[PDB]
Write an enzyme that holds these catalytic residues in place. Structure first.
Site, PDB file in Angstrom:
ATOM      1  N   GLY A 102       0.845  -0.015   7.689  1.00 17.92           N
ATOM      2  CA  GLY A 102       2.103  -0.282   8.355  1.00 17.92           C
ATOM      3  C   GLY A 102       3.178   0.724   7.995  1.00 17.92           C
ATOM      4  CB  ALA A 147       6.913  -1.174   4.666  1.00 17.70           C
ATOM      5  CD  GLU A 151      10.870  -8.891   8.555  1.00 24.46           C
ATOM      6  OE1 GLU A 151      10.782  -8.822   7.312  1.00 24.46           O
ATOM      7  OE2 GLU A 151      11.530  -8.080   9.236  1.00 24.46           O
ATOM      8  CG  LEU A 171      -7.386  -0.304 -10.842  1.00 24.64           C
ATOM      9  CD1 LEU A 171      -7.883  -0.398  -9.412  1.00 24.64           C
ATOM     10  CD2 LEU A 171      -5.869  -0.237 -10.880  1.00 24.64           C
ATOM     11  CD  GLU A 194      -5.580  -2.136 -21.113  1.00 18.33           C
ATOM     12  OE1 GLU A 194      -6.205  -1.068 -20.942  1.00 18.33           O
ATOM     13  OE2 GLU A 194      -4.674  -2.268 -21.963  1.00 18.33           O
TER      14      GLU A 194
HETATM   15  N1  LIG Z   1      11.357  -0.704   1.293  1.00 19.97           N
HETATM   16  C1  LIG Z   1      11.004  -0.442   2.548  1.00 19.97           C
HETATM   17  N2  LIG Z   1      10.818  -1.478   3.439  1.00 19.97           N
HETATM   18  C2  LIG Z   1      10.460  -1.219   4.718  1.00 19.97           C
HETATM   19  C3  LIG Z   1      10.272   0.085   5.152  1.00 19.97           C
HETATM   20  N3  LIG Z   1       9.924   0.043   6.460  1.00 19.97           N
HETATM   21  C4  LIG Z   1       9.883  -1.248   6.858  1.00 19.97           C
HETATM   22  N4  LIG Z   1      10.226  -2.041   5.791  1.00 19.97           N
HETATM   23  C5  LIG Z   1      10.286  -3.508   5.769  1.00 19.97           C
HETATM   24  O1  LIG Z   1       9.098  -3.989   6.368  1.00 19.97           O
HETATM   25  C6  LIG Z   1       9.359  -5.127   7.166  1.00 19.97           C
HETATM   26  C7  LIG Z   1       8.809  -4.903   8.568  1.00 19.97           C
HETATM   27  O2  LIG Z   1       7.466  -4.494   8.476  1.00 19.97           O
HETATM   28  P1  LIG Z   1       6.971  -3.043   8.972  1.00 19.97           P
HETATM   29  O3  LIG Z   1       6.179  -2.381   7.868  1.00 19.97           O
HETATM   30  O4  LIG Z   1       8.139  -2.181   9.393  1.00 19.97           O
HETATM   31  O5  LIG Z   1       6.044  -3.379  10.250  1.00 19.97           O
HETATM   32  P2  LIG Z   1       4.545  -2.808  10.401  1.00 19.97           P
HETATM   33  O6  LIG Z   1       3.790  -2.969   9.105  1.00 19.97           O
HETATM   34  O7  LIG Z   1       4.541  -1.368  10.855  1.00 19.97           O
HETATM   35  O8  LIG Z   1       3.851  -3.761  11.496  1.00 19.97           O
HETATM   36  P3  LIG Z   1       4.328  -3.812  13.035  1.00 19.97           P
HETATM   37  O9  LIG Z   1       4.894  -5.183  13.334  1.00 19.97           O
HETATM   38  O10 LIG Z   1       3.124  -3.571  13.915  1.00 19.97           O
HETATM   39  O11 LIG Z   1       5.370  -2.750  13.290  1.00 19.97           O
HETATM   40  C8  LIG Z   1      10.859  -5.327   7.192  1.00 19.97           C
HETATM   41  O12 LIG Z   1      11.166  -6.406   6.341  1.00 19.97           O
HETATM   42  C9  LIG Z   1      11.427  -4.049   6.613  1.00 19.97           C
HETATM   43  O13 LIG Z   1      12.565  -4.323   5.834  1.00 19.97           O
HETATM   44  C10 LIG Z   1      10.456   1.134   4.259  1.00 19.97           C
HETATM   45  O14 LIG Z   1      10.294   2.298   4.624  1.00 19.97           O
HETATM   46  N5  LIG Z   1      10.822   0.862   2.956  1.00 19.97           N
END
Ligand SMILES: Nc1nc2c(ncn2[C@@H]2O[C@H](COP(=O)(O)OP(=O)(O)OP(=O)(O)O)[C@@H](O)[C@H]2O)c(=O)[nH]1
Ligand SMILES: Nc1nc2c(ncn2[C@@H]2O[C@H](COP(=O)(O)OP(=O)(O)OP(=O)(O)O)[C@@H](O)[C@H]2O)c(=O)[nH]1
Ligand SMILES: COc1ccc(/N=N/c2cc(OC)c(OC)c(OC)c2)cc1O
Ligand SMILES: [Ca+2]
Ligand SMILES: [Mg+2]
Ligand SMILES: [Mg+2]
Lengths: 436, 426, 155
Positions: free
Chosen positions: A10, A12, A183, A252, A254
């Site tokens: 994803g 993030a 979420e 991993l 430990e």
């Molecule tokens: N710390 C941090 N959080 C992130 C980042 N990008 C998205 N998030 C968090 O991730 C959550 C949303 O999930 P995403 O990872 O963006 O969605 P995805 O995994 O690509 O899945 P999709 O629904 O298909 O887009 C939200 O709560 C965001 O705050 C990032 O670059 N850094």
């Protein structure tokens, strides 16, 4: 030397993976093209950094990593970024259509069309390992791909790699920088399904990282770039024992031994100190005792909770830099005289200490100043149950009205899985209450 | 999740649909011939969402123009951008529908529906990743209402996994005092509840009251009303046409705005309200949640917001927007349901619309929309009790039971809005 | 039977056919299955001339169908202002009530015929008349948020 494979799922997981591997290179002296001049053995080796990097015949050091996302926008930035030549092109896997913030799309419908390709690419990296010990999975809770696909991936990994360990770096949702209303749904659904397939999960609370950026780094409105640079500094401190010589958490296994007394309660809390703004370049250097005291302040924790409301079941202190071991002993002896630190009756009330004598690396362009010594505290405390309680409440508010449930059932998912996931969370809360 | 296939049916659908292309082309830098005259790369980054790229760097709107009345086709081509449309996409019948929902849905429009589906397939198969369909139409007429809903049902059968979005114009006696419009609207609402994923309710009653009482236009015309429509259609599609901090698409909007499948009728609002010829952030946030700025004639303070999406356009502090939006949710906390946490989402876009420096577009899923359906249901019932002009419909194959089912489903929809307006968290 | 032919001629707007049928003894006050007279159908479909010729030949201006609808009810509902004034000038009961409790003012207000609302008020429409649900014409304006209609009712 036992190899570790990182998986980034994803948006993030990918973006945080990008900042981590950038930091890994600077710590190990690896250039963006993969060249490592201080590597005496060209074409292979058995050094500690080889657990995360493989080597080609041309002396190129390639990360043992796979980047997966159901849409290409985020991963395309890695294909054209500063470290584009660092990763194998076949490691970066993208679909065409994402999960639309829907756990069921990432797990059942859209995720099934690419799951087999991801495992075959993972198997390609696993075959290049002489002693694969496990996987590090980076993903968010709230994303459809980060939750739905990750659960699907961890299931298949338990089948194909039964004896291997699986560690999670998970992004806990926060309202300040959220993306979707559902979420809380995706967070509970992926926690229930991955709970039995994960050996240890480090939750990163976006609200905790957000406040640290505002209060310690003087950043008015933090962005994902600000949060991810700070997060990577903590992830590096947690995995430094796997990439360097050390005596604490050398593999991993430990991690589970030292941090996970029981399988279901495998959510350690991380604390990092000091976090000083780069604008304060000529800051006074903090002592070992000062940064150690800061690890027990709730304002420095990666998950918002009060450890004074809970009991400790494990505590590991990982130091980096100019740290004399006898100063840690005196600093710990002061902490042992504090009512805020209470261990459970059945655990040996002690602190495990590991010292890496190299100071932390700062990324050029980052918001952090250079420090001579830093500490990361990994502890398993019952106070992290408060984070699950806040998440369960948001789930209960929407699910009681059955709001948004039709989006999940419409993607090949029975409604009973909501209650089954919710009941498992209720059991997890009781697991903490029965401990303390 | 990239390309959207735009369709427009009937006089109203083609009229407001033409103004939509004139507004967004001006924002993207496209001229009536179809060449990029812009000065920013952010104008072509997501241009493929609505346009097909041809040879010679020529962008063509992915639009399909439908109407049983042949006269509407000529008025479109005589427009400023009438030449930018692909001539193969003009599907126009011979005889009009005469404001008869039964003609557009069962007889006249049923003969022309297969000619339209052929054009839809050709446009859909020319898409890298089809996002969904976008329809503009009125509910009070016969073509956009009767055939428009027919088109939705057939497209839904062939593309069941794609998003169906409509911009539906609600009838009002203040604009067109034709008494069969409550019939056509109610019959269409019965179709819109089943076959669309998200519907923008554009109320001619609201548009007239804004022109008459707020803009002080003594005698508003359709161009005065369509000016408010095009400004709203531009705002609601901002996050689909420009990058922004979110990869917004039609499905992510539906997933996060529609908590229950039938409650997918959105109340759009715009700020500031201007007229053809003629602002702080706290003013935009305040004026957005004002009843005089809603494109549906309903008081949002008579109901509760289920979900809200707000779009700000122009140079402004995203911290100030975060502070001001967080302020409105506290003074008006009683107007937001408490069992959907974080139900207000805000996006900031740098490019503002033409002739404006600061803009605020509001997309609300509010229970107060029942006032719009109660109004149509009451007019429908007043006519239907006396069986007035019912032979115009039954004489085209319609069974009399179809009116009772539309009325029943209309009242059920109102009961569902009232149900969640009164529900609490406890 | 010329009564059935007069009913169809009144609905269709065939002025010449109406005069021929009446001259041959057609029942001006003939009723269909639901009790509608030629004056009902002519007032519904906006045939002002047929309304006038019927009233000059013994048409009952206050006839009711099975649902209790007078010609003024239907003219106020459909929105034929000229026919409404012709009916009122020939003695139509401005406050007639149907089986639903509706007066012509109710129907004109619900459908937004503001000019007809003014005419009915000028001829003694009862603003306090309630339907079977207790709603008056002013209640309808307040409930649907019709400010223009609310002003007219307070003149
Ligand atoms: N710390 C941090 N959080 C992130 C980042 N990008 C998205 N998030 C968090 O991730 C959550 C949303 O999930 P995403 O990872 O963006 O969605 P995805 O995994 O690509 O899945 P999709 O629904 O298909 O887009 C939200 O709560 C965001 O705050 C990032 O670059 N850094
Ligand atoms: N806001 C707005 N409403 C319009 C416009 N044109 C028509 N309408 C409304 O649309 C309703 C009637 O539908 P139309 O689109 O005109 O008719 P149609 O869909 O082509 O079907 P037919 O009546 O058979 O021709 C009326 O209530 C009008 O008020 C317009 O340009 N702008
Ligand atoms: C109610 O909460 C949410 C709603 C939708 C969400 N994302 N989808 C979009 C967001 C948009 O503006 C913020 C938007 O512009 C109006 C849009 O146009 C298609 C889609 C995310 C949310 O948390
Ligand atoms: Ca080597
Ligand atoms: Mg994503
Ligand atoms: Mg027309």
């Amino acid at each position: 030397m036992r190899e570790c494979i990182s998986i980034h799922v994803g948006q993030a997981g990918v973006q945080i993976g990008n900042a981590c591997w950038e930091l890994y290179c600077l710590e190990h002296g690896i250039q963006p093209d993969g060249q490592m001049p201080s590597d005496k053995t060209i074409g292979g080796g058995d050094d500690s950094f080889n657990t995360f990097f493989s080597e080609t015949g041309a002396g190129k050091h390639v990360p043992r990593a796979v980047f997966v996302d159901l849409e290409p926008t985020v991963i395309d930035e890695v294909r054209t970024g500063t470290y584009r030549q660092l990763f194998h092109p076949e490691q970066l896997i993208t679909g065409k259509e994402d999960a639309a913030n829907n756990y069921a799309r990432g797990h059942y419908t859209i995720g099934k069309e690419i799951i087999d390709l991801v495992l075959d690419r993972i198997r390609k990296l696993a075959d290049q390992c002489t002693g694969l010990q496990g996987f590090l999975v980076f993903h968010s809770f709230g994303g459809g791909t980060g939750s739905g696909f990750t659960s699907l991936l961890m299931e298949r990994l338990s089948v194909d790699y039964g004896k291997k360990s699986k560690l999670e770096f998970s992004i806990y949702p926060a309202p300040q920088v959220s993306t979707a209303v559902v979420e809380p749904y995706n967070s509970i659904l992926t926690t229930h399904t991955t709970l039995e397939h994960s050996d240890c999960a480090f939750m990163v609370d976006n609200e905790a990282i957000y406040d640290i950026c505002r209060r310690n780094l003087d950043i008015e409105r933090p962005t994902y770039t600000n949060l991810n640079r700070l997060i990577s500094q903590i992830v590096s401190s947690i995995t430094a024992s796997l990439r360097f010589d050390g005596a604490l958490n050398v593999d991993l296994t430990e991690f589970q031994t030292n941090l996970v007394p029981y399988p279901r309660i495998h959510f350690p809390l991380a604390t990092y100190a000091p976090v000083i703004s780069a604008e304060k370049a000529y800051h006074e250097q903090l002592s070992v005792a000062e940064i150690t005291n800061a690890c027990f302040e709730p304002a420095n924790q990666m998950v918002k909770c009060d450890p004074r409301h809970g009991k400790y079941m494990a505590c590991c202190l990982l130091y980096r830099g100019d740290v004399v071991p006898k100063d840690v002993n005196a600093a710990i002896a002061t902490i042992k005289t504090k009512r805020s630190i209470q261990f459970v009756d059945w655990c040996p009330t002690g602190f495990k200490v590991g010292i890496n004598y190299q100071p932390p690396t700062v990324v050029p362009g980052g918001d952090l100043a250079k420090v001579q010594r830093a500490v990361c505290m990994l502890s398993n405390t019952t106070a992290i149950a408060e984070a699950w309680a806040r998440l369960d409440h948001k789930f209960d508010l929407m699910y009681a009205k059955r709001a948004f449930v039709h989006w999940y059932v419409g993607e090949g998912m029975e409604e009973g899985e909501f209650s089954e996931a919710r009941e498992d969370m209720a059991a997890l809360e009781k697991d903490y209450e029965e401990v303390g | 999740m990239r390309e959207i296939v735009h369709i427009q049916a009937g006089q109203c659908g083609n009229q407001i649909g033409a103004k939509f292309w004139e507004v967004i082309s001006d924002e993207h830098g496209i001229d009536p011939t179809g060449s990029y005259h812009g000065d920013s790369d952010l104008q072509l980054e997501r241009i493929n969402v609505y346009y097909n790229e041809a040879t010679g760097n020529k962008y063509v709107p992915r639009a399909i123009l439908v109407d049983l009345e042949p006269g509407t086709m000529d008025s479109v081509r005589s427009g400023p951008f009438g030449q930018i449309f692909r001539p193969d996409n003009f599907v126009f019948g011979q005889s009009g529908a005469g404001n008869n929902w039964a003609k557009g849905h069962y007889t006249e429009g049923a003969e022309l529906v297969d000619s339209v589906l052929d054009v839809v397939r050709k446009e859909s198969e020319s898409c890298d990743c089809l996002q969904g369909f976008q329809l503009t139409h009125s509910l009070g007429g016969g073509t956009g209402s009767g055939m428009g809903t027919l088109l939705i049902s057939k497209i839904r059968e062939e593309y069941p996994d794609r998003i169906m979005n409509t911009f539906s114009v609600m009838p009002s006696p203040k604009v067109s005092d034709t008494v069969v419009e409550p019939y056509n609207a109610t019959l269409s609402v019965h179709q819109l509840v089943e076959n669309t994923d998200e519907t923008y309710c554009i109320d001619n009653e609201a548009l007239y009251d804004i022109c008459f009482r707020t803009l002080k236009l003594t005698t508003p015309t359709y161009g005065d009303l369509n000016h408010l429509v095009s400004a709203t259609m531009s705002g609601v599609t901002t996050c689909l046409r420009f990058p922004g901090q979110l990869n917004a698409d039609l499905r992510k909007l539906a997933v996060n705005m529609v908590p229950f499948p039938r409650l997918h009728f959105f109340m759009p609002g715009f700020a500031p309200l201007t007229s053809r010829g003629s602002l702080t952030v706290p003013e935009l946030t305040q004026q957005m949640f004002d009843s005089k700025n809603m494109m549906a004639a309903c008081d949002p303070r008579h109901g509760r917001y289920l979900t809200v999406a707000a779009i700000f356009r122009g140079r402004m502090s995203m911290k100030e927007v975060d502070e001001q939006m967080l302020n409105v949710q506290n003074k008006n906390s009683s107007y937001f349901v408490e069992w959907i946490p974080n139900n207000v989402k805000t996006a900031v876009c740098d490019i503002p619309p033409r002739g404006l420096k600061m803009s605020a577009t509001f997309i609300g899923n509010s229970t107060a929309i029942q006032e719009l359906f109660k109004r149509i249901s009451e007019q429908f019932t007043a006519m239907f009790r006396r069986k007035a002009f019912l032979h115009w419909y039954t004489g085209e194959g319609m069974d009399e039971m179809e009116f009772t089912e539309a009325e029943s489903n209309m009242n059920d929809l109102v009961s569902e809005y009232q149900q969640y307006q009164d529900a609490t968290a406890d | 039977d010329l009564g059935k032919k007069l009913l169809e001629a009144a609905r269709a707007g065939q002025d010449d056919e109406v005069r021929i049928l009446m001259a041959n003894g057609a029942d001006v006050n003939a009723t269909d299955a639901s009790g509608l007279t030629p004056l009902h159908l002519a007032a519904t479909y906006g045939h002002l001339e047929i309304v006038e010729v019927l009233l000059k030949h013994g048409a009952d201006v206050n006839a009711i169908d099975i649902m209790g609808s007078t010609p003024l009810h239907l003219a106020a509902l459909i929105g034929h202002l000229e026919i409404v004034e012709v009916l009122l000038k020939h003695g139509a009961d401005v406050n007639a009530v149907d089986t639903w409790g509706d007066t012509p003012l109710h129907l004109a207000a619900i459908m937004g015929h503001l000019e007809i609302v003014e005419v009915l008020l000028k001829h003694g429409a009862d603003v306090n008349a309630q339907d079977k649900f207790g709603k008056t014409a002013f209640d309808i304006s307040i409930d649907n948020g019709n400010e223009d209609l609310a002003e007219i009712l307070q003149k």
